[PDB]
Amino acid sequence: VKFQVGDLVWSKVGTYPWWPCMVSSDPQLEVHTKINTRGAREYHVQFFSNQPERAWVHEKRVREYKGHKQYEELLAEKIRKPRPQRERAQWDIGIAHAEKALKMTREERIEQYTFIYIDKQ
Numbered sequence: 001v002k003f004q005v006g007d008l009v010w011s012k013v014g015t016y017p018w019w020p021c022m023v024s025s026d027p028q029l030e031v032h033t034k035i036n037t038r039g040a041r042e043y044h045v046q047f048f049s050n051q052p053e054r055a056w057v058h059e060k061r062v063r064e065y066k067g068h069k070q071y072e073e074l075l076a077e078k079i080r081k082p083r084p085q086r087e088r089a090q091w092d093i094g095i096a097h098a099e100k101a102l103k104m105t106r107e108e109r110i111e112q113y114t115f116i117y118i119d120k121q
């Protein structure tokens with residue numbers, strides 16, 4: 001376990017670009033990390049965005065978030081993929097939240113950003 005609740009990370013999931021996240025406890029499993037069905041470690045993350053979403057992400061697809069300018073370094077891990085405008089606008093919102101979160105303590109971030117989960121009736 002390298003990440004704890006409230007840690008800021010970048011996550012690379014499916015078709016999406018590296019995305020700013022906050023590690024959090026899964027509302028059902030009450031853990032922020034687990035070993036998956038293939039025996040690999042995963043972390044539970046909240047994606048910063050105007051659209052709250054969460055996911056379990058494989059540890060190899062998670063990186064410590066040091067700042068928005070680290071994005072170029074992640075791509076370096078000349079040819080470049082373009083990015084759709086709608087997705088870029090959502091990513092810019094997520095980054096603005098991540099940058100604000102970076103200036104907070106882990107306790108302040110947990111209070112400010114942890115999602116509220118409502119059971120579907």
Ligand SMILES: Cc1cc(=O)n(C2CCNCC2)nc1-c1ccncc1
Pocket residue numbers: 013014016017019047048049050051052053054055090
């Ligand atoms: C980056 C990203 C990766 C991902 O796998 N998902 C899924 C989460 C679960 N629901 C279906 C999308 N959403 C996002 C995302 C994108 C923009 N705003 C919020 C979240």
